[PDB]
Write a protein that binds this ligand. Structure first.
Ligand SMILES: Nc1ncnc2c1ncn2[C@@H]1O[C@H](COP(=O)(O)OCCCCC[C@@H]2SC[C@@H]3NC(=O)N[C@@H]32)[C@@H](O)[C@H]1O
Ligand SMILES: Nc1ncnc2c1ncn2[C@@H]1O[C@H](COP(=O)(O)OCCCCC[C@@H]2SC[C@@H]3NC(=O)N[C@@H]32)[C@@H](O)[C@H]1O
Lengths: 317, 318
């Protein structure tokens, strides 16, 4: 229920070097046994820590802790809150909706209640991945939310394809895949009034340096950038994402989906494959062929191609 | 706290004279104190005038809202009647977790009634209908604009059927009669793309209101009474609740299609010069109705484009 010690601890180990319990316990003022209890809390947070007789405690690889002012300096205005431990970055912005401005972001080292759609859970181990959320004020209201979801998918895919990710594709209308496994989850939440503006919170959970996953939280099948072959400074990659999304949406307000229609066709990881759609709880099946101009997924269930505006797509086993 | 001003208006609601005498006893207070609530009522928008020699009175009887009565004309679904509330929309939005599609609430008075872009909805006590209904859409945020069009269509159709012959709709929310606002409709929602959407529909229908606070209502306004239609609020609420429920069942299941042409015949601005405000941008053109997706079709210099968002309004000189 109290996080200061384990945080101070991860700050120490964060350099990838050995710290003996004797030294840690000295720096921190507690018994060696107590220093191990905190080491144990870090392990619960998803931090991987080992011990080596003589040397001490270590991280398999260094961690580059997020630095607000560091990411801020690579930006054009905008505000960025960097949080050690949060319930959900999305929740964090939703709660601050009235003081926010478009493109404001919030990013955390660790989520204790990271979430997805349909009440699902999003595995968020400390410091291994990017847990980033950005706020946006869509002047053209809720009707524009889906197209917005599509722009985000296309943009993040682009930023990562330019860094080594070849087979990184998008999922209609949220999430990134690669070699056919959730590489990143995107959760767009919103409050609006039809005929007025929509307040939007975009949440992205990008799998980067993660090594092991908890089978009963992630049954699905996952993948990481680290397994793609890339090691991005989270601080660097957050910069590039906020920069690009802020510009891509500024542009989508001005031109709609139009400039993104073709880009979606190349990136759809599901264009032309046996899929399945879920509406509430009533199952429905078929095949797919891109989207239309208003961003609706095009579903051919037996010869005829009808467009659906909602639901969750997925390959069928 | 106002347990009392309510006890007081329950007593005055029939429109009969009730002297400062009678009141004092069947209300346990000094006539000087009972005169303090009669002012709280004036502050809530009730026109209480006192005529020494006969007592206090209301210019016209008020048929207080009665949950039992309403509920008894419906089949299932909760209908919460709230004497005094801040906003019927806020009431439901605050209960999204326990509400089921079609649950509703009505109030006599709204202390913070609201419209779009941070505007106030003038809501004097017991003169108008202030109703909200909750709905859970599995299609998510995309379907919200369609939902708004259905509500306007259905509400208009009901009032026309009840006798106000020329009531029309404004894309995508609100009802008009003779180019003045008859009913304000405010649809709010929370949701996530790719999941459900929780929607709260708010209706502010002008009925018996005789005067307005000019600094809240500066545009034209009109009541059902001026349309010659004199309805009981409980009766209309039951009617509207039953009809919106059936229409949203139909929408949920078949979308906008079954409503498309019904729209074109009720549109108040079709083929007329309008202004579309988006954010801080006013753009001008001619309305041409809606497309199958519910987007407004705006013609600007011979070219027609679909607009999925924005606020519309009439343009005309004097
Ligand atoms: N790390 C993971 N990698 C691969 N699969 C996983 C991972 N964690 C959980 N899963 C699996 O994803 C499934 C479905 O997620 P989704 O609801 O489609 O998901 C939509 C997107 C969720 C968004 C995450 C971001 S983090 C920043 C922001 N804050 C927040 O609470 N959510 C978003 C889960 O139930 C689980 O099987
Ligand atoms: N009683 C009135 N009659 C005619 N004009 C008026 C009235 N009150 C205020 N106005 C004018 O309406 C304008 C704007 O309304 P709107 O945002 O288009 O409006 C969208 C719809 C408003 C929603 C009202 C309902 S009441 C039940 C529910 N609860 C709640 O808080 N809002 C909705 C106001 O700024 C004002 O000039």
């Amino acid at each position: 229920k109290d996080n200061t010690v384990p945080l101070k601890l991860i700050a120490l180990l964060a350099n990838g070097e050995f710290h003996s319990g004797e030294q840690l316990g000295e720096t921190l003022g507690m018994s060696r046994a107590a220093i191990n209890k905190h080491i144990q809390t870090l392990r619960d947070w998803g931090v991987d820590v080992f011990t080596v007789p003589g040397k001490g405690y270590s991280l398999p690889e260094p961690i580059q802790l997020l630095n607000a002012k560091q990411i801020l300096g690579q930006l054009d205005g905008g505000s960025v809150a960097v949080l050690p431990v949060i319930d959900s970055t999305n929740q964090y912005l939703l709660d601050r909706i009235g003081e926010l401005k478009s493109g404001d972001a919030c990013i955390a080292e660790y989520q204790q209640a990271g979430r997805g759609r349909r009440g699902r859970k999003w595995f968020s181990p400390f410091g291994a991945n990017l847990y980033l959320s950005m706020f946006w004020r869509l002047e053209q209201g809720p009707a524009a939310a889906i197209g917005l979801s599509l722009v985000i998918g296309i943009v993040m895919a682009e930023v990562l394809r330019k860094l080594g990710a070849d087979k990184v594709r998008v999922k209609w209308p949220n999430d990134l895949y690669l070699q056919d496994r959730k590489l990143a989850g995107i959760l767009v939440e919103l409050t609006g009034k039809t005929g007025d503006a929509a307040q939007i919170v975009i949440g992205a959970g990008i799998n980067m340096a993660m090594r092991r996953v908890e089978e009963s939280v992630v049954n699905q099948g996952w993948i990481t950038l680290q397994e793609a072959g890339i090691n991005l400074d989270r601080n660097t990659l957050a910069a590039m994402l906020i920069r690009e999304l802020r510009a891509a949406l500024e542009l989508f307000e001005q031109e709609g989906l139009a400039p993104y229609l073709s880009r979606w066709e190349k990136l759809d990881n599901f264009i032309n494959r046996p899929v399945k759609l879920i509406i509430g709880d009533k199952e429905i099946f078929g095949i797919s062929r891109g989207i239309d101009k208003q961003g609706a997924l095009l579903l051919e269930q037996d010869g005829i191609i009808k467009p659906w505006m909602g639901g969750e797509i997925s390959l069928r086993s």
